[PDB]
Amino acid sequence: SDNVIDIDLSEDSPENYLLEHAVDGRMLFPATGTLVLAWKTLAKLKGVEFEQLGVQMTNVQIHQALFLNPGGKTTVSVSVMPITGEFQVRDGESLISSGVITSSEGRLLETDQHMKKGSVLDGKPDKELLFTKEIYREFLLRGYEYGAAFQGIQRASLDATDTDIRWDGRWISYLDTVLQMYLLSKPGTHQALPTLLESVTIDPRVHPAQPPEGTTEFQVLPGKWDPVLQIAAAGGVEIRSCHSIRASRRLNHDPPILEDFAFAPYVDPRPSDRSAAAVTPALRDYADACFEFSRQGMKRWLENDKNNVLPNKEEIKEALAMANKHANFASAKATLEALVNNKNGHRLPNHGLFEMLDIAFSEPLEGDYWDRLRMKLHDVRTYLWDDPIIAALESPDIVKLVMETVSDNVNQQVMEILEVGAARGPYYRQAIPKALEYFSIKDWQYTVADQGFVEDAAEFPVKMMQFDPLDPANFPAELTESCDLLVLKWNLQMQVDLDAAITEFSKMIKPGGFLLVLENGTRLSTFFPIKAIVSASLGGKGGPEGDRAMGCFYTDAQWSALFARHGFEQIMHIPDGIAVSMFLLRKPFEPSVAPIIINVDDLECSWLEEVQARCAELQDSHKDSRLWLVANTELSGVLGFLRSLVWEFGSEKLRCIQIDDATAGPNPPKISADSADFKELVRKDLAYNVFKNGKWGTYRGFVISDADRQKERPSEYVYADWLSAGDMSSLRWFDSPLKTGHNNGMLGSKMAHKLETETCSVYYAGLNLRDIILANGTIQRDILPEETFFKEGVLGVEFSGRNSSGKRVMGLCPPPALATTVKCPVSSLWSVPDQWTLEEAATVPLAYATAYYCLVSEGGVQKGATVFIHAGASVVGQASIAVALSYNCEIFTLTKNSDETALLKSMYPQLNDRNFCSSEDCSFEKYIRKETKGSGVDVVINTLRGKFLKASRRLLSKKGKFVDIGFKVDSNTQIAYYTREHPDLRFQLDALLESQGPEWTRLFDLVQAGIHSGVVKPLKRAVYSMDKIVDAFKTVEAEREAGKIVIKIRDEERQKVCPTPRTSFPAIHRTCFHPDKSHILVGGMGGMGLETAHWMVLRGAKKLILTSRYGITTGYQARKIAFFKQLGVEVEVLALSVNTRKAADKVFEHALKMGPVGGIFNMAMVLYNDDFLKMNREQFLKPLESKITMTMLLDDKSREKPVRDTLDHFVMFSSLIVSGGHLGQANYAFGSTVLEKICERRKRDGLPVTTPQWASIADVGTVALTIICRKYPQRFFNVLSVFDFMMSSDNVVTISYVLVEESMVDQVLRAVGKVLGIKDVSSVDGDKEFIDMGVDSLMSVEIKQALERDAGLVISTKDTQLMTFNTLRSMVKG
């Protein structure tokens, strides 16, 4: 109605700086933005200039978020009431801000900060001051992405009190920099969006005028944060009592890929090896049964045949001989159908071969046989391609080992892949999505070819071609020396003359190129029936290796001999054992000049000069020349040294060999010049040869599936939490730190109350409406008592189980009581009478504890009084009635339907139909006001809101008490709580349980008395198993029926005093650190170390020893070290480099004096970057002190007592240079690999070990100061999410890196899908509602404003979470 403001976010608009203010990629309109809009509107209403007006806003609620549209225009409709001052910023029919704005001509500023002249932060050292770089590192880690216009604070103190805010003319930015003093006054790790500024004064007549136009050296106005009054003041601005709401963090990039750098043998892999085929017992049994099906079926073909219709009839008869050589129909299917319908968990992903064998066999013998079934089997060809037998040599592990080992050894910049015969056996469907979509250093070229057009290869990044694959001598001459890798999936068998086929195909391979073949080698009669129908002809020429089986196919042993006979070198060979078999072949390499061997065994780098000289001649040598780096010991970082060296010299003449002495078999290799084992290696000419576990292989990074990050394993102590906040379908069971004895959240306030606690084993956990409210996002955990801020979880309070002595007990404890073990204060634990089962006792404590608090403690009920109870059927409602009846009260209750009324009457016979009303409408007021004869009700237990709350107040007697225990309070009544206008009684039982003072003991005595006197009686119950936690929570939320919901954790024993049997529960990982153990963080005072030490402190660590070469040398370090000490952590900062056994002893001496050493982390780095040839000895060994010299001295200490018995974690941070390499960092690659091998010797001996192998990381360190080797930097809040996975894992090194990535109907769908965090909208189901995937409270508003910004649709927020993708598509068209 009033002034409409147009925010122009264009390329050169003056308000283009408003885009330099984002929260994890969300470009929101500043909360102080609405303050200026309201401020300017009032001035325009008054007619004065907005800079000459002194205003004061009160209770500025940011009702909803405004998402600024980049490169566009947003409109708001500020409206100010003339005399009252009620201002309102809105956009259409949606509210965006509210409050009251008032102008005045007198002093509006409370604090006397507009008078300060200079800056208190003068003359202070650099280690007692924060600067612009360090202040906004703190904000960035919390999700606040400030740009250059919003980076006002130039300096500050370690206390955050004094600042040097900059004044540059813009008011929306200045008021935000004053609101940043509030945010950096509350150190933490979560992301909070301000939503209520209780008072703001912007008196501009005491504020310096706008800078003279053209200024660049803007002045700085001293500011200060008043922790007493909660006032942030700077110049002529003050913001007082600003509150915020926690928000979940959004990942701007895509999820990381985690791999497992592990050794993988090349030839004849044993079952225990990683390159071995994936043959579980279930698959082998399926092949046996299915092979029997082929045997039994093929018998029927030669029995029913009477018209001579069987294609290639003679072949089937010949094949049956093989089946009998390597040995009813109804039983054959019976066995398979038993396997096809079982759900024991040992099932195969799908049974495709049988579906193809069944359709062919079951098909009838009659006319058009050959053509009819040749057109039907071809339609189910997907079954043969996607089958467990065939998917055993196409699994991700084997496919990657193939493509990467080829990529490493191809000495060009583009990997050319040519597959011939792609219509029958396609290898692009496996090669591309499993191995070639993870490439980041080599670009690939895939060419599919066959007789016709490849239909299924249409969606893949391939190029098509046409020639005859089944006939040689006709392959186009344009393909000579055209591909580095040749793929022949199920193609060589269809040739008639193999010798003519191989010799011609070998002309395809470039010099040093590779060839790949997949063929059936064992049990050759199993797949024939499909082949017989599909193959037009089955006539082929045998060879010296033997006559071709059937007309096509050749036994594995024959293939190997044939390829060997034709002068091929077997680089790899993976025999599946059930059917197919893979060969990866390459021609021999005969050097014309003797190879050069340089032993790189030494770790002191006595070989550096030799390598430097002999690698400087690589650019002027014969192509056949080579340089081999040989290491005959386990500890040698030559696999990262080469991979970084090959970046500066090419892969034509750089090779390495590493013999692992520890794992070398009884016959170790004898690689020495004119040796025997060496000559074999030279012929293969592979860039990476490692002898480990008695086989030649290569170190490869195998991708860890994303499903394993949430895999559940047995755990003794577990507790329920949520994976994503605000989603009730994401509740899982995580590991509980109570395995360490103590509990998380022992920081800050929780250390002031030294309550004596009894460790209890939870048998039943009660579910209240408090837990559902927190779980489904209706309330953030910050509303709870401050003592629960750092707790592991906030779900569950009541329980019933057995104490440490075996007695049966029940009570209330600070959360999480929804666990299997709790530490309940001894003053909150009642004893179960010897008439209630542990199931019944789980319903009493909270329901009756709140009933007594509402009536006897807060309402002061008296005998004969009249009480009004809302929601009589609820658990607290039922408890309230029982207490009141014991007090001989007159009861009026609100019952939803007649079932609830009947239920209550049955439970309490004293209730007639006169004591019941209806909650459907506020018609009870007349009834209660007539039956009480106008006196009203003495006590009102209120849960309903809105008009029912008003009517309930009006029923109060003159001395009546109103107890409001509802959870979904309004906005005005939420302000009342903040400003101390009303008391917040909806989380008082929680607050009492933290303190457990005189107020609580009154309730403990009352409930305890109630048990004895018979008032306290168990309520109705509904037990839910542990795994049905999600269903239990939904049942409580719906409130479709009355009764308690209790989760059964264990089974109550028959005895009454007996020990709890030790059992395990399935739960997700959660790393925890012992509070009584000291943790060493070597080099932990920098970048990732300080933000990792923060993570450990939140997860249990309370004893840290941070080590550095100098000490605390920056203001950011001194601030966080002071922050930890404030939280109750004992931090000792040592300025000692551990580069000598003496120093290592000193560091651990200061450790054992704090507590048993229960962790050693090395996050040290000293980088020197330069080309390998220009680096002297001293310059080379610079990054080799924190990664080699240290890690061996820290390793040695952990191997010797008393640390060995006590040590629990041993983490050695590494980088991707070990697996990807880099240029100039030959030294850092060498050291980083030796750190990766010292962490595998620990695994051989069984000691704990972990070695994260990171990639570019953001927000903290080296990169912090983007895209290197095409890999995007990770967000640290993800670095710590995967790091938690890394610690609770069995592997040594876990690679973690991030790789960089129409109609109007599809336009908005992609945008809407992007909000939810979906990369392919089409992939997910079109019938699955948004709430099912997950839509918290900010994704819905973004979609709501996007469906209007992008299209004309205007939807409701609630409608967003219950609408499918199909609904959205069908709605935009309308």
Ligand SMILES: NC(=O)C1=CN([C@@H]2O[C@H](COP(=O)(O)OP(=O)(O)OC[C@H]3O[C@@H](n4cnc5c(N)ncnc54)[C@H](OP(=O)(O)O)[C@@H]3O)[C@@H](O)[C@H]2O)C=CC1
């Ligand atoms: N940052 C990234 O993006 C990546 C990180 N990593 C790994 O993660 C860690 C990153 O830490 P980051 O802080 O980023 O590196 P920084 O260079 O940012 O700081 C590293 C710390 O190492 C400490 N340090 C170096 N040498 C010694 C020594 N001899 N004795 C004690 N302390 C020492 C320094 O303390 P002072 O300066 O006081 O001596 C410095 O604070 C490293 O271990 C690195 O290998 C892996 C891949 C990439």
Ligand SMILES: *P(=O)(O)OCC(C)(C)[C@@H](O)C(=O)NCCC(=O)NCCSC(C)=O
């Ligand atoms: P639901 O629980 O209804 O969610 C309420 C939300 C959407 C969080 C709403 O209250 C909101 O968006 N408030 C935030 C307003 C805001 O963005 N203020 C600060 C500006 S951005 C900044 C600090 O970077």
